[PDB]
Amino acid sequence: GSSGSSGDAAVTPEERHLSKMQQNGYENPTYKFFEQMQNSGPSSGIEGRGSSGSSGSSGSSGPTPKTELVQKFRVQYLGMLPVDRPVGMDTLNSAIENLMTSSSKEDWPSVNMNVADATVTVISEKNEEEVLVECRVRFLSFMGVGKDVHTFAFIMDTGNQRFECHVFWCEPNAANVSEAVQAAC
């Protein structure tokens, strides 16, 4: 796909915001925190020997979940594209073209972006319990758009240092989407 306009008089307030996402993108801070978590360093002292190690998981309920509105957007699901890097405009984009050639524009099933409680869940158009894809912003490492604003992708973590890049088509542009998802971050 060859993108490029001949000229232009004035720039729209929607594009400008999209340009930024095209420059470098949006990196999630949390992800970083999850890695290096500040903790006490008692290392200092008269202790330099001994081997130990334990593990466990305690559970306890408290408050109750309440009803909270949600944001739903209309978009298509090109598919999932495996990557080697957690971030990088060259990694996310590359994936786009990959899925683009994989299936046609009509091949992509019309889905809906369910943005709630900082959770990105791609719910089918008709089916609500389909949960075609389940992504959590808190886990989202990097996200950005392709050469074209209409194309919107994002990188998510599944497990075992794994990263998946999903693409979605937005209309008219991915400005209302790239903004709704970011706010969740």
Curated annotation (Swiss-Prot):
Signal peptide: none annotated. Disruption phenotype: Knockout mice develop cataracts from 16 months of age with defects such as ulcer-like anomalies in the cornea, and opacity in the lens cortex or wider lens. Decreased muscle strength, however clasping ability is unaffected. Impaired spatial memory retrieval and learning. Reduced branching of hippocampal neurites and increased fragmentation of neuromuscular junctions. APBB1 and APBB2 double knockout mice show progressive retinal lens disruption from 1 month of age, morphologically lenses show massive vacuolization, lens capsule rupture and disruption of the lens fiber cells organization. It comes from the Eukaryota. Residues 67-185 form the PID domain. It is found in: Endoplasmic reticulum; Golgi apparatus; Early endosome. Expressed in the brain, retinal lens and muscle cells (at protein level). Plays a role in the maintenance of lens transparency, and may also play a role in muscle cell strength. Involved in hippocampal neurite branching and neuromuscular junction formation, as a result plays a role in spatial memory functioning. Activates transcription of APP. Interacts (via C-terminus) with APP (via C-terminus). Interacts with APLP2 (via cytoplasmic domain). This is Amyloid beta precursor protein binding family B member 2. It comes from Mus musculus. The chain holds residues 582 to 704 of 760 of the full protein.
